[PDB]
Design a protein around this ligand. Structure first.
Ligand SMILES: Cc1cc2nc3c(=O)[nH]c(=O)nc-3n(C[C@H](O)[C@H](O)[C@H](O)COP(=O)(O)OP(=O)(O)OC[C@H]3O[C@@H](n4cnc5c(N)ncnc54)[C@H](O)[C@@H]3O)c2cc1C
Ligand code: FES
Lengths: 309, 97
């Protein structure tokens, strides 16, 4: 059975909220919790942060939050830190089915001398460490919400959605999937095909596996889930396994869906796209199609959704 | 005050619409049925990059462009407030590096 969520009036809005809070006057939110999502073998830490906005900074799935870390811009004295954007990883109701909180999936950005391999704390990510270092009760300068590119197309409750993600790129999909399968949303009964491809470094780096594996059990006919552990698996030629390699294992199947009107999304660091595109190019050609033309058509049909950074 | 913002596509296509001085140009344009390129929509990238011909805007809510790029006339339309009538050329992301 699905989890009851409230308040339902959060379904009433016709247009998504945008820029409810700007940098000059951010909303002061409160940290509800912070937990590491990875094991000891993960290259670095990625944490789950729950934030209490009290219903003041509501949002729609696929959107992001702005966070302004304390201190002054190191590049502009007297000026506050630039806002860092973070893809909201929770549905509009939040992990509390409250409609009161939202969540972020934050990768800790750290610096290591290319040689001595020693970390220089003075050179690591300000906002990401600030976030993952937070404790219950800490205040956070919140801006937004923002974005429209990753809004989930709901006109067709039986539409097909192929989700390709790497690292923190899984964030918006965690939002989609809770909405399609875990939450009891009367006006959105997903009955299509949700397919999630997630590529990470190793299994200790998997993000929300118990959650996604859970959908594979509850909705075998509506959810497909393929993982790629780059530092533990290998592709056909012996090199590290990447998401495009897993996408390749289902090339014909994936192109059918796209040809049938399926939506495809990409999210995570931008260095994931080059390989993805090359693989798509080679797959379209092994089928006799022009990739440039197909991309142009997919975009035309509003089936192509990218949120890399 | 509400100004008139005139946009120029990468092929001479033009669009002139009302733009409140307290509304981002990207939003003022979409209100008038004008489709413009965008990504983050929060002044963190260059996808919405544009270049001033005449007029001025306040895009301090943005942080992707450096002083030099802004000196040349480049503006992030998703976080730009028109400060007067302007003429802006769209799809300039390709000029940024
Ligand atoms: C639309 C959008 C969505 C995003 N979604 C997510 C998300 O869901 N999860 C996520 O984790 N991130 C996301 N990001 C990225 C995020 O906004 C930040 O860019 C990221 O967390 C790094 O910010 P930071 O403040 O930690 O680091 P910054 O201080 O900005 O530093 C950037 C890099 O410079 C390094 N550095 C700093 N000083 C030095 C020095 N002196 N020498 C050498 N290196 C140095 C840092 O260690 C770091 O790796 C998103 C970005 C956008 C635009
Ligand atoms: S869409 Fe990214 S800065 Fe405007």
């Amino acid at each position: 059975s699905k989890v009851s969520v409230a308040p339902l009036h959060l379904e009433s809005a016709k247009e998504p909220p945008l820029n409810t809070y700007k940098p000059k006057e951010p909303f002061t939110a409160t940290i509800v919790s912070v937990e590491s999502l990875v094991g000891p073998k993960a290259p670095g830490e990625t944490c789950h942060i729950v934030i209490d906005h009290g219903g003041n900074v509501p949002y729609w799935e696929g959107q992001s939050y702005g966070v302004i870390p304390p201190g002054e811009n190191p590049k502009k004295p007297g000026a506050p830190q630039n806002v860092r954007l973070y893809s909201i990883a929770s549905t509009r109701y939040g992990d509390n089915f409250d409609g009161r909180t939202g969540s972020l999936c934050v990768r800790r950005a750290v610096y290591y001398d290319p040689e001595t391999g020693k970390e220089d704390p003075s050179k690591n990510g300000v906002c990401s460490n600030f976030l993952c270092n937070s404790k219950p009760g800490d205040k956070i300068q919140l801006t937004g919400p923002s974005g429209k590119i990753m809004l989930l197309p709901e006109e067709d409750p039986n539409a097909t959605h192929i989700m390709i993600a790497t690292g923190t790129g899984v964030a918006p999909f965690r939002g989609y999937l809770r909405r399609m399968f875990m939450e009891d949303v009367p006006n959105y009964r997903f009955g299509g095909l949700a397919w999630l491809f997630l590529g990470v470094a190793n299994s200790d780096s998997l993000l929300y596996d118990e959650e996604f594996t859970s959908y594979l059990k509850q909705y075998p006919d509506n959810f497909r889930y393929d993982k790629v552990l780059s530092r533990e698996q290998k592709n056909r030629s012996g090199g590290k396994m990447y998401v495009q390699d897993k996408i390749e294992e289902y090339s014909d199947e994936i192109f059918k869906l796209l040809d049938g009107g399926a939506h495809i999304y990409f999210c995570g660091l931008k260095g994931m796209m080059p390989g993805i595109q090359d693989t798509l190019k080679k797959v379209a050609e092994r089928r006799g199609e022009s990739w440039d033309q197909k991309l142009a058509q997919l975009k035309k049909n509003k089936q192509w959704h990218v949120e890399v950074y | 005050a509400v100004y008139k913002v005139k946009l120029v596509g990468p092929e001479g296509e033009e669009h002139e619409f009302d733009a409140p001085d307290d509304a981002y140009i990207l939003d003022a344009a979409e209100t008038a049925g004008v489709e413009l390129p965008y990504s983050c929509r929060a002044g963190a990238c260059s996808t919405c990059a544009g270049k001033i011909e005449s007029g001025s805007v306040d895009q301090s809510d943005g942080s992707f462009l450096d002083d030099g790029q802004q000196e040349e006339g480049y503006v992030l339309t998703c976080v730009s407030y028109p400060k007067s009538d302007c003429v802006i050329h769209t799809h300039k992301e390709g000029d940024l590096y």
